[PDB]
From Swiss-Prot, chain B:
Belongs to the CSN1 family. This is COP9 signalosome complex subunit 1. The PCI domain is necessary and sufficient for the interactions with other CSN subunits of the complex. Mediates the interaction with CAPN8. The N-terminal part (1-216), which is not required for deneddylating activity and CSN complex formation, is nevertheless essential for other aspects of CSN complex function, such as repression of c-fos/FOS expression. It is found in: Cytoplasm; Nucleus. Component of the CSN complex, composed of COPS1/GPS1, COPS2, COPS3, COPS4, COPS5, COPS6, COPS7 (COPS7A or COPS7B), COPS8 and COPS9 isoform 1. In the complex, it probably interacts directly with COPS2, COPS3, COPS4 and COPS5. Interacts directly with inositol kinase ITPK1. Interacts with CAPN8. Interacts with USP48. Interacts with ASB4; this interaction negatively regulates GPS1. Widely expressed.
Swiss-Prot record, chain E:
Its main location: cytoplasm. A motif (JAMM motif) lies at residues 127-140. It comes from Homo sapiens. One of its GO terms (cellular component) is cytosol. It comes from the Eukaryota. Its cofactor is a divalent metal cation. This is COP9 signalosome complex subunit 5. Keywords: Acetylation, Cytoplasm, Cytoplasmic vesicle, Hydrolase, Metal-binding, Metalloprotease, Nucleus, Protease, Signalosome, Synapse, Zinc. One of its GO terms (molecular function) is deNEDDylase activity. The gene is COPS5. GO terms for biological process: exosomal secretion; negative regulation of apoptotic process; positive regulation of DNA-binding transcription factor activity; positive regulation of transcription by RNA polymerase II; post-translational protein modification; protein deneddylation; protein neddylation; proteolysis. Its EC number is 3.4.-.-.
From Swiss-Prot, chain G:
It is found in: Cytoplasm; Nucleus. This is COP9 signalosome complex subunit 2. Belongs to the CSN2 family. It comes from Homo sapiens. It comes from the Eukaryota. Phosphorylated by CK2 and PKD kinases.
Curated annotation (Swiss-Prot), chain H:
Amplified and overexpressed in some osteosarcomas (OS), suggesting that it may participate in TP53 degradation in OS. The lineage of its organism: Eukaryota, Metazoa, Chordata, Craniata, Vertebrata. Belongs to the CSN3 family. It comes from the Eukaryota. Component of the CSN complex, composed of COPS1/GPS1, COPS2, COPS3, COPS4, COPS5, COPS6, COPS7 (COPS7A or COPS7B), COPS8 and COPS9 isoform 1. In the complex, it probably interacts directly with COPS1, COPS4, COPS8 and COPS9 isoform 1. Interacts with CK2 and PKD. Interacts with the translation initiation factor EIF3S6 and IKBKG. Interacts with ERCC6. It comes from Homo sapiens. Widely expressed. Expressed at high level in heart and skeletal muscle. This is COP9 signalosome complex subunit 3. The gene is COPS3. Component of the COP9 signalosome complex (CSN), a complex involved in various cellular and developmental processes. The CSN complex is an essential regulator of the ubiquitin (Ubl) conjugation pathway by mediating the deneddylation of the cullin subunits of SCF-type E3 ligase complexes, leading to decrease the Ubl ligase activity of SCF-type complexes such as SCF, CSA or DDB2. The complex is also involved in phosphorylation of p53/TP53, c-jun/JUN, IkappaBalpha/NFKBIA, ITPK1 and IRF8/ICSBP, possibly via its association with CK2 and PKD kinases. It is found in: Cytoplasm; Nucleus.
Length: 280, 57, 57, 121, 291, 213, 98, 43
C-alpha cells in the first residue's frame, strides 16, 4: 500500500518551535510553511530533519519560491550527505484548496511529494499530525490533487527515548506555578484511561459474543478467561510486608524534610522577630 | 562500650550482639522529632512572654 | 549462581524480591491485554473499528 | 466550676494565657481535684493577654508552678519536667519565693524521669 | 474539566522567555554588567530542540569527533540557548580543525536564518569528546581564552557521545572560564584552576510540553509498570548525602544557604512521595480486584 | 495447529473410527484444549448409542479434573499412561488457575500420588511441555506459577467472565474519579497560598504609599 | 622456610572452599584440609583477625558462619547523618535570641 | 519491642506529620502579622 512512512520525534519539535516563535513575534498566530527531508529506500520513506522554506504571498495566495530552496539545498548537503527532498509541512486543520494550490508547485519541484499536517488547535486523543500522499486524478477538467491518508510510525534511534525522558522529567514545573501534583497525577491518568478503554473494548466484544452479534470464536474467549483469572496479582504476605516497609520508609523520609522546612520557617520568624519587638 | 556482646549465665556463654540498623535509625529519628517539637513550643512560649515585658520586677 | 547451607543441607539457586516480581506480573498482564486486543482486531476488523468509532463519541 | 466559664468567656482564643489560669490551678490544687484542670493544661499557651495593665509575673509563675505540681501528682513526669523548666527560665532580676520551689522540685522530677539532673538551657 | 486548566491560547512565563526584547538586549549589552566582576553568570538554560540536535550530530559523527555552533541570548544573570546548528568539519577522533568550509558555513547559515526570521546571534560552540569524559583540553582552554576575551558573551559546551549512549544519561557540560590573572579533582583535568563548571537547566514551551506529553503517552505499560524509587535508589542516596553536606555548611554559616538546602530537601521529599503515590495507585488499581 | 490437523478427518467418519480418532487426539501430545473438537455435531451425536462413555470421557478432559475420574472410574474405558499424564497436567493447570501458590499437600491429595519425587517429576515434565510457567520451592513445599494457560470454557460461564471484567472497569473508573478530586484540591491549595502572598504584598506597599510623606 | 609453606596452600584451599557456603561445619574443613580440629580453628581465627575471611566462628556448635548478609542499607546511614545535622541546626535556631 | 512495618507506626508518623504541619502553620500566621506591622517597615 503506497509507501511506509517513518516519522521521527524531531520534525514535530521543529514545527512547534517555529509556531511558538512566530506566535510570540507577531502576537497573532499565523500559518507557517516548511519542508521535510529524509531517505527513500524502495517502498519505504523515512523523515530525518526539516528546515523552513521561505514563502511569498501574492494578493491572497501563497507561493513557494524556487531560488531560495535551490540555494539552501546545496548548503545542508555538506553536513547531511544521503538526505533528499520528500515534502513539506504546514499548520492548519482540514485540507483547504489553498493546500492544493501550494502543493501544485511542490509537485512541480518533486514528482510525488509527501504532506504533513500539524494542528495546534486539536481537541482529540489522536496524533495532531497526518501524512498525505499526492494522487493525480484522471477525470477530465480541473484535475485536483487528491490526498491519500497513510499510516505514520514512531521509528526512533537509540537516543530518542532517553532525551525525551530527560526533558520531560522537569518541564519547568516549579517555575510556572503549575503544581507538581497537576503534572504527576495527570501524566499517568491518561495511561490509566487508555487501559480502561482497552478493557472496555474487550468487555464489549465478550458481551457481543455472548449475545450473538459476532460468531462464536472459541479461541479468544479462552484468552479472556485466562486474563480474567490473573487479576489478583501477588496477594502473598511477603509482598504486603515489603509494601508496608516501603510505605514506612517513605514516611520517615518525608518526616525528615518536613522537619527542616518547619525549621527554616522557624529561623525566618526569629530573624524577623529580632528586629521588630527587640532592638538589635 | 568496647565489646557489643551479651552474657548468658545459664550456660555461661558470651553471645555477639548485632544491631538492627533500621530500627535504631527509626528510633533516633522519632526521638529527634519529639525533641524538636518540644524545643519549638518552648521557644514560642518564650517569644510570647518576652514580648509583653515580663521580667519579675 | 546460588549458595549452599550445609546445616540444613539446602542449595538455594534463585530468589525473587517480591516487588520486581510484581512489576514483571503487571507487565505480563499489560502485554496479554495488548495481544488480546490485537487478536480481536485481526479477527473482526470491521466490528472492532465500529466499536472504536462508537466509543470515540 | 466558676473559673471554667470565667476563663472560657474572657480569653480571645483557647491558646491565650489569662490571669485566672493561675487561680483555677490553685483552687483545684489546694483541694484535691486534678481532672477538671486537665483540659486547660493539655493546651500549649501561645499568647498572653495584656489585660490592659496589671498581670505581673507572679500569675505566670504561679500558673506554671501549680500546673507542674498537678502533673507530678498524676504521675505524668515527662510534662511536669517541662512545666518546671518553663517556670525556672523566666527572666528575673531578684530572688523570688516561687522559683525556689520550682528548681527544688525540678531536680527531683528530672532524677525520677531521667537518670540525671538535666542541664538548664 | 478533567484537566481543569487545559489550554486554548493562555500561557505563562514559561512561554514568555521565547521573545526578543530589542531595547532590553541593547541596554544590557551597553551596560555590560558581567565585565565588572569575574563571578557572573552561573545559570545556563538550553532548550530541548538544541539538545536533541546536538545529540543526533554527535551520534552521526560516530567514533570520530564533530563540532558545531549554538544560538541564543543572555538575560540578566542567566544565559538562554535555544538553537543548535551543526558544521561540516572532519578529522581524527582526537583532533578537529575548522577549515574554510566551516568559515563559509556559519556566515551562510546565519544569513539564511536571518532571511527566515531568526533574530538570535552566536552564543557559543559544542564539541564532542568520544570517550574521554567532559573536560576542556589545552587547545580548548586557549580557544576559550581568546573567545571569551574578544567576544565577552560566550560559553563552551562539551558532551561525551559514547558514555551518554552506554550509560543512558546525557553528558551535557556547559563551561565558562576565568580570565587570565585571577588565580583563586583529577577528572576535570590539569587546568582545573583556569576553567570552571556551570549548572545546566532546560525549558520547553506550552505547545512543546503538550506535544511531548501526548507523544510520550504511548508508553503506558512502562508508565504504570516502572515502579520508580527502586531504580533511582543510588541517585536518592547521593542526593541525601549532598543534603547532609549542605546542611552542615549552612549550620557552619549560621555560626542564604539555608534556603537552598530547604529547596533541595523539598525536591527530594516531593520525588519520594511521588514514587510512593504511584506505588499506592498501582496497588489500588491492580491488587484490589477479584478479591 | 494440532487440533486443526486432527479436525478435518472427523467430518466424514462416524462410529468406531470417530471414537478411535478422539482417542488418538486425547493421546497426541501438544493438544490440551478440546474446544472445537467437542463443538462438532458428530461428537455431540454420540450421546445416543453405545459410545456415550467416550463422550463423557471427552467432557471430563475438556472441563473436569482428576477427582472427577474417581467416582466414575469403572464407567469409562481403560486409559493409557499418556492419557493419564495429560489428565494430571490438566488438573495441575486447573488448580494453578485459581491460586498462584499451590501447596505440595494439596497437589498430592488431588493427583492421588504417593511419593514427593514422582510429583516433582510430573510437575517438571508439565513445565517442560510448556503449559504452565513457574518454580518449585522445597523449603516451603510450594509451587509458584507466574502464568498458566486458560482451560476450556463452556457456553454458560461467559456471563461470569463479563462480571469480572465489569468489576475491573468499575474500579478503574473509581480511581479516575479520585485522581480528579485530588489534583483539583492540590491546585486550589497552591492558588490560595499565592493569593494570600499577593494580598500581603499589596498591604505592605500600601503602607509604603502612606509612610513616604 | 617449609613452615611458611604448607600454610599458604592451606589458606588458599580454605578460601577457595568456603566461597559458596553460608554455614559450614568445622570438622568438614578439617577433613578437607587433612588437619585436626584445633589447627583448623587456629587457622580460621588467624585468617579472620587479618581481615581476609569475611565470617565468624560459633564455638558452641563448632560452626563457621559466612557473611552472605548485610545488604546495601547505606540509605539508612545517610538518613542518620541527616538527622544529626538537623539536630545541630535546631540548636542554632531556638537559642538564637529567644 | 517492634519492627517498623506495622501500620500503627505509620499512623504514629502521620500524627507527627499533622502536629508539625500545624506548628508550621501557626508559625507562618505569627510571622505574617510581623511582616505587616507598621513598625517593621522603617528598618
Amino acid at each position: 500500500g503506497s509507501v511506509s512512512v517513518a516519522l521521527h520525534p524531531l520534525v514535530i519539535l521543529n514545527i512547534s518551535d517555529h509556531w511558538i516563535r512566530m506566535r510570540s513575534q507577531e502576537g497573532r498566530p499565523v500559518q507557517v510553511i516548511g519542508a521535510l527531508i529524509g531517505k527513500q529506500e524502495g517502498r519505504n520513506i523515512e523523515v530525518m530533519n526539516s528546515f523552513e522554506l521561505l514563502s511569498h504571498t501574492v494578493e491572497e495566495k501563497i507561493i513557494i519560491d524556487k531560488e531560495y530552496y535551490y540555494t539552501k539545498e546545496e548548503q545542508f548537503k555538506q553536513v547531511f550527505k544521503e538526505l533528499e527532498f520528500l515534502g513539506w509541512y504546514t499548520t492548519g486543520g482540514p485540507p483547504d484548496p489553498s493546500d492544493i494550490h501550494v502543493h501544485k508547485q511542490v509537485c512541480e519541484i518533486i514528482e510525488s511529494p509527501l504532506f504533513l499536517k500539524l494542528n495546534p488547535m486539536t481537541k482529540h486523543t489522536d496524533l495532531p499530525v497526518s501524512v498525505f500522499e499526492s494522487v493525480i486524478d484522471i477525470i477530465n477538467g480541473e484535475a485536483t490533487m487528491l490526498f491519500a491518508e497513510l499510516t505514520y510510525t514512531l521509528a526512533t534511534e537509540e537516543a530518542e527515548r532517553i532525551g525525551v525522558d530527560h526533558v520531560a522529567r522537569m518541564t519547568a514545573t516549579g517555575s510556572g506555578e503549575n503544581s507538581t501534583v497537576a503534572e504527576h497525577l495527570i501524566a499517568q491518568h491518561s495511561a490509566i484511561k487508555m487501559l480502561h478503554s482497552r478493557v472496555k473494548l474487550i468487555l464489549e466484544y465478550v458481551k457481543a459474543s455472548e449475545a450473538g452479534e459476532v460468531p462464536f470464536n472459541h479461541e479468544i474467549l479462552r484468552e479472556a478467561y485466562a486474563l480474567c483469572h490473573c487479576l489478583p496479582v501477588l496477594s502473598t504476605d511477603k509482598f504486603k510486608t515489603d509494601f508496608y516497609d516501603q510505605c514506612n520508609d517513605v514516611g520517615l523520609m518525608a518526616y525528615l524534610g518536613t522537619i527542616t522546612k518547619t525549621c527554616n520557617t522557624m529561623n525566618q520568624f526569629v530573624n524577623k522577630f529580632n528586629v521588630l519587638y527587640d532592638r538589635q | 562500650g568496647l565489646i557489643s556482646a551479651r552474657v548468658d549465665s545459664h550456660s555461661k556463654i558470651l553471645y555477639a550482639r548485632d544491631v538492627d540498623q533500621r530500627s535504631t535509625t527509626f528510633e533516633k529519628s522519632l526521638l529527634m522529632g519529639k525533641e524538636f517539637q518540644r524545643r519549638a513550643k518552648a521557644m514560642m512560649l518564650r517569644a510570647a512572654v518576652l514580648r509583653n515585658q515580663i521580667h519579675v520586677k | 549462581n546460588g549458595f549452599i547451607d550445609q546445616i540444613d543441607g539446602i542449595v538455594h539457586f534463585e530468589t525473587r524480591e517480591a516487588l520486581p516480581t510484581w512489576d514483571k506480573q503487571i507487565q505480563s498482564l499489560c502485554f496479554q491485554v495488548n495481544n488480546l486486543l490485537e487478536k480481536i482486531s485481526q479477527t473482526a476488523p470491521e466490528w472492532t473499528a465500529q466499536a472504536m468509532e462508537a466509543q470515540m463519541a | 466550676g466558676i473559673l471554667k466559664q470565667a476563663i472560657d468567656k474572657m480569653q480571645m482564643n483557647t491558646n491565650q494565657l489569662t490571669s485566672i489560669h493561675a487561680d483555677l490551678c490553685q483552687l483545684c490544687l489546694l483541694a484535691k481535684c486534678f481532672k477538671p484542670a486537665l483540659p486547660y493544661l493539655d493546651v500549649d499557651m501561645m499568647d498572653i493577654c495584656k489585660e490592659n495593665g496589671a498581670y505581673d509575673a507572679k500569675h505566670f509563675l504561679c500558673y506554671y508552678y501549680y500546673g507542674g505540681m498537678i502533673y507530678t501528682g498524676l504521675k505524668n513526669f515527662e510534662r511536669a519536667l517541662y512545666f518546671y523548666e518553663q517556670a525556672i527560665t523566666t527572666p528575673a532580676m531578684a530572688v523570688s519565693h516561687i522559683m525556689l520551689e520550682s528548681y527544688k522540685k525540678y531536680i527531683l522530677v528530672s532524677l525520677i524521669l531521667l537518670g540525671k539532673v538535666q542541664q538548664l538551657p | 474539566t478533567w484537566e481543569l486548566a487545559n489550554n486554548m491560547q493562555e500561557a505563562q512565563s514559561i512561554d514568555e522567555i521565547y521573545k526578543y526584547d530589542k531595547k532590553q538586549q541593547q541596554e544590557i549589552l551597553a551596560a555590560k554588567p558581567w565585565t565588572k566582576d569575574h563571578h557572573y553568570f552561573k545559570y545556563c538554560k538550553i532548550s530541548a530542540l538544541a539538545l536533541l540536535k546536538m545529540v543526533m550530530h554527535a551520534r552521526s559523527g560516530g567514533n570520530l569527533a564533530v563540532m558545531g555552533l549554538m544560538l541564543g541570548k543572555v538575560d540578566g544573570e542567566t544565559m538562554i540557548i535555544m538553537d543548535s546548528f551543526a558544521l561540516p568539519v572532519e578529522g581524527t577522533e582526537t583532533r578537529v580543525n575548522a577549515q574554510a568550509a566551516a568559515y563559509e558555513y556559519m556566515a551562510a547559515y546565519i544569513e539564511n536564518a536571518k532571511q527566515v526570521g531568526r533574530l538570535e546571534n552566536a552564543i557559543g560552540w559544542y564539541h564532542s569528546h568520544p570517550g574521554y569524559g567532559c573536560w576542556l583540553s589545552g587547545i580548548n582552554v586557549s580557544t576559550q581564552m581568546l573567545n571569551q576575551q574578544f567576544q565577552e558573551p560566550f560559553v563552551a559546551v562539551v558532551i561525551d557521545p559514547t558514555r551518554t549512549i552506554s550509560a543512558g544519561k546525557v553528558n551535557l557540560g556547559a563551561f565558562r572560564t576565568y580570565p587570565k590573572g585571577y588565580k583563586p579533582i583529577e577528572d576535570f583535568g590539569v587546568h582545573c584552576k583556569q576553567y570552571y563548571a556551570l549548572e545546566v537547566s532546560y525549558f520547553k514551551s506550552s505547545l512543546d510540553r503538550k506535544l511531548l506529553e501526548l507523544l510520550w503517552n504511548k508508553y503506558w505499560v512502562n508508565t504504570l509498570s516502572s515502579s520508580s524509587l527502586l531504580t533511582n535508589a543510588d541517585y536518592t542516596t547521593g542526593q541525601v548525602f549532598d543534603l547532609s553536606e549542605k546542611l552542615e555548611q549552612s549550620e557552619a554559616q549560621l555560626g542564604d544557604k539555608l534556603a537552598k538546602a530547604t529547596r533541595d530537601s523539598c525536591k527530594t521529599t516531593i520525588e519520594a512521595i511521588h514514587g510512593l503515590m504511584s506505588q499506592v495507585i498501582k496497588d489500588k488499581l491492580f491488587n484490589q480486584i477479584n478479591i | 495447529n494440532l487440533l486443526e490437523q486432527f479436525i478435518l478427518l472427523a467430518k466424514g467418519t462416524s462410529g468406531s473410527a470417530l471414537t478411535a480418532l478422539i482417542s488418538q487426539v486425547l493421546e497426541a501430545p501438544g493438544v490440551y484444549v478440546f474446544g472445537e473438537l467437542l463443538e462438532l455435531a458428530n461428537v455431540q451425536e454420540l450421546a445416543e448409542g453405545a459410545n456415550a462413555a467416550y463422550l463423557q470421557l471427552l467432557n471430563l478432559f475438556a472441563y473436569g479434573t482428576y477427582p472427577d475420574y474417581i467416582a466414575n472410574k469403572e464407567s469409562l474405558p481403560e486409559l493409557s499412561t499418556a492419557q493419564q499424564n495429560k489428565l494430571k497436567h490438566l488438573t495441575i493447570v486447573s488448580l494453578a488457575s485459581r491460586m498462584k501458590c499451590i501447596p505440595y499437600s494439596v497437589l498430592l491429595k488431588d493427583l492421588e500420588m504417593r511419593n514427593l519425587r514422582e510429583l516433582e517429576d510430573l510437575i517438571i515434565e508439565a513445565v517442560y511441555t510448556d503449559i504452565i510457567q513457574g518454580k518449585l520451592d522445597q523449603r516451603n513445599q510450594l509451587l509458584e506459577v507466574d502464568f498458566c494457560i486458560g482451560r476450556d470454557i463452556r457456553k454458560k460461564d461467559i456471563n461470569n467472565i463479563v462480571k469480572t471484567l465489569h468489576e475491573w472497569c468499575d474500579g478503574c473508573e473509581a480511581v479516575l474519579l479520585g485522581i480528579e478530586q485530588q489534583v483539583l484540591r492540590a491546585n486550589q491549595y497552591k492558588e490560595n497560598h499565592n493569593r494570600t502572598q499577593q494580598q500581603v504584598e499589596a498591604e505592605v506597599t500600601n503602607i509604603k504609599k502612606t509612610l513616604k510623606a | 622456610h617449609i613452615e611458611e609453606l604448607l600454610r599458604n596452600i592451606r589458606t588458599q584451599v580454605l578460601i577457595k572452599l568456603i566461597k559458596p557456603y553460608t554455614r559450614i561445619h568445622i570438622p568438614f574443613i578439617s577433613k578437607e584440609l587433612n588437619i585436626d580440629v584445633a589447627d583448623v580453628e587456629s587457622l580460621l581465627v588467624q585468617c579472620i583477625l587479618d581481615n581476609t575471611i569475611h565470617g565468624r566462628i560459633d564455638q558452641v556448635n563448632q560452626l563457621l558462619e559466612l557473611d552472605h548478609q548485610k545488604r546495601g542499607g547505606a540509605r539508612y546511614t545517610a538518613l542518620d547523618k541527616w538527622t544529626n545535622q538537623l539536630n545541630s541546626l535546631n540548636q542554632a535556631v531556638v537559642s538564637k535570641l529567644a | 519491642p517492634e519492627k517498623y512495618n506495622n501500620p500503627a507506626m505509620l499512623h504514629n508518623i502521620d500524627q507527627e506529620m499533622l502536629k508539625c504541619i500545624e506548628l508550621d502553620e501557626r508559625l507562618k500566621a505569627m510571622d505574617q502579622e510581623i511582616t505587616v506591622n507598621p513598625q517593621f517597615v522603617q528598618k
